[PDB]
């Protein structure tokens, strides 16, 4: 068995919340799992959630350079590829680089030290984008399994962010999927293999679109499009703003 094990395996259907825009300042949402930013949340916030019986997944970008992070200066010029979408503040990483991999180990150390129960590593799908580094599916598979073994070695769980094409090659090392918008793009069957194997899909839809963020609701039709799909009863769906601030609705 060329995989490592995690002690925390959340159940299919576990209710969750995700808030990545700012330091978490709303724990009123009755969700068992909170996915929050690794860097901008402190140990006391994470422990406070766990004291309330919740599990904390710590988000970070494993496949992109973000120019606002406190470790941004660790990255070398040779680690960086093309902009994610025309802004140099976020760039694709050479995920095969020893230096990139060591930075991600440093970030996993931080997650462990802060008490994170699991980690949610973003942008492991450079192969499906204009990355400028000839990234491949095999590169992501190697990288994701590297991240999973490193997280498990630090007693943390991990999951696959989108990247549906590589599911067969990493799923044994994953404790969940985080999916965005499979309902909008006719791909939820791809991700349904996770609950078929006892693992949740933490599922996000963005019905207000990519330019509107507010605390107001969506239509019943937009809610039904996000919520009702084959096997959706096994997906842990949240309806969110694209900016992933506090606001959330549940199915």
Ligand X SMILES: *[C@@H]1O[C@H](CO)[C@@H](O[C@@H]2O[C@H](CO)[C@@H](O[C@@H]3O[C@H](CO)[C@@H](O)[C@H](O)[C@@H]3O)[C@H](O)[C@H]2NC(C)=O)[C@H](O)[C@H]1NC(C)=O
Ligand Y SMILES: *[C@@H]1O[C@H](CO)[C@@H](O[C@@H]2O[C@H](CO)[C@@H](O[C@@H]3O[C@H](CO[C@H]4O[C@H](CO)[C@@H](O)[C@H](O[C@H]5O[C@H](CO)[C@@H](O)[C@H](O)[C@@H]5O)[C@@H]4O)[C@@H](O)[C@H](O[C@H]4O[C@H](CO[C@H]5O[C@H](CO)[C@@H](O)[C@H](O)[C@@H]5O)[C@@H](O)[C@H](O)[C@@H]4O[C@H]4O[C@H](CO)[C@@H](O)[C@H](O)[C@@H]4O)[C@@H]3O)[C@H](O)[C@H]2NC(C)=O)[C@H](O)[C@H]1NC(C)=O
Ligand Z SMILES: *[C@@H]1O[C@H](CO)[C@@H](O[C@@H]2O[C@H](CO)[C@@H](O)[C@H](O)[C@H]2NC(C)=O)[C@H](O)[C@H]1NC(C)=O
Ligand U SMILES: *[C@@H]1O[C@H](CO)[C@@H](O)[C@H](O)[C@H]1NC(C)=O
Residues 116/56, Cβ–Cβ less than 8 Å: yes
76 sits near ligand Z (criterion: CB under 6 A): no
Q: Which does 196 bind (CB under 5 to 8 A by kind): ligand Z, ligand Y, ligand U, none?
A: ligand U
Task: State the Cα angle at 68 between 64 and 74, rounded to 5°.
Answer: 65
Q: Please select the residue that binds ligand Y; options are 243, 249, 250, 251, rule is CB under 6 A.
A: 243
* DSSP codes joined into one string, 207-224: TT-SS---S----HHHHH
Pattern of binders to ligand X over 114-143, x per CB under 6 A? Answer: ---------------------------x--
Interface region with ligand Z, contact rule CB under 6 A, candidates 18-26, 90-98, 176-184, 214-222: 90-98
Cross-strand partners of 93: 80
- Pick out residues in 162-181 that bind ligand X (CB under 6 A): 168-170, 172-173
> Residue by residue, what is the 3-state secondary structure of 140-186?
HHHHHHHHHHHHHHCCCEECEECCHHHHHHHHHHCCCEEEECCCCCC
Q: For residue 232, what are its two tokens?
A: 């959706």
Query: According to the binding rule CB under 6 A, does residue 231 interact with ligand U?
Result: yes
Q: Considering the rule CB under 6 A, would residue 25 count as an interface residue with ligand Y?
A: yes
Q: What are phi and psi of 233, to 5 degrees?
A: -60, -15
In this structure, is the dihedral angle defined by the CA atoms of residues 68, 148, 47 and 162, taken in order, positive or negative? positive
State how far Cα 175 lies from the chain centre. 12
Residue 195 makes contact with ligand U by CB under 6 A: yes
Q: Which does 155 bind (CB under 5 to 8 A by kind): ligand Z, ligand X, ligand Y, none?
A: ligand Z
Dihedral (CA of 147, 100, 74, 84) sign: negative
Least spacing, CB of residue 236 vs ligand U, in Å: 12
Binding site for ligand Y (CB under 6 A): 21-22, 25-26, 213, 243, 245-246
Binding site for ligand U (CB under 6 A): 12, 195-196, 231, 233-234
Binding site for ligand X (CB under 6 A): 2-3, 141, 145, 168-170, 172-173
Binding site for ligand Z (CB under 6 A): 7-8, 94, 96-98, 117, 133-134, 155
């Amino acid at each position: 068995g060329n995989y490592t094990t995690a002690k925390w395996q959340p159940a299919v259907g576990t209710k969750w919340q995700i808030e990545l825009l700012y330091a978490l300042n709303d724990t009123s949402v009755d969700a068992e799992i909170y996915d929050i930013d690794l860097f901008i949340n402190d140990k006391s916030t994470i422990a406070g959630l766990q004291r309330a019986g919740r599990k904390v997944i710590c988000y970070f970008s494993a496949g992109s350079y973000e120019n606002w992070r406190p470790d941004k200066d660790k990255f070398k010029d040779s680690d960086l590829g093309h902009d994610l979408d025309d802004w140099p503040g976020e760039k694709w990483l050479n995920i095969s680089s020893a230096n990139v991999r060591q930075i991600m180990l440093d970030r996993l150390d931080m997650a462990r030290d802060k008490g994170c129960d699991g980690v949610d590593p973003d942008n492991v799908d450079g192969y499906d984008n204009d990355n400028g580094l000839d990234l491949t599916q095999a590169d992501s598979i190697s990288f994701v399994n590297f991240l999973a073994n490193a997280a498990h070695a630090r007693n943390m769980s991990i999951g696959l962010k989108n990247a549906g094409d590589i599911i067969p090659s990493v799923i044994k090392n994953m404790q969940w999927s985080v999916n965005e918008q499979c309902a909008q793009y006719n791909e939820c069957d791809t991700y349904a293999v996770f609950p078929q194997n006892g693992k949740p899909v933490f599922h996000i839809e963005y019905p207000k679109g990519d330019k509107t963020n507010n605390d107001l609701s969506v239509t019943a039709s937009q809610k039904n499009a996000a919520c009702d799909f084959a096997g959706s009863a096994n997906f842990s769906t949240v309806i969110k703003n694209m900016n992933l601030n506090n606001w959330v609705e549940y199915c």
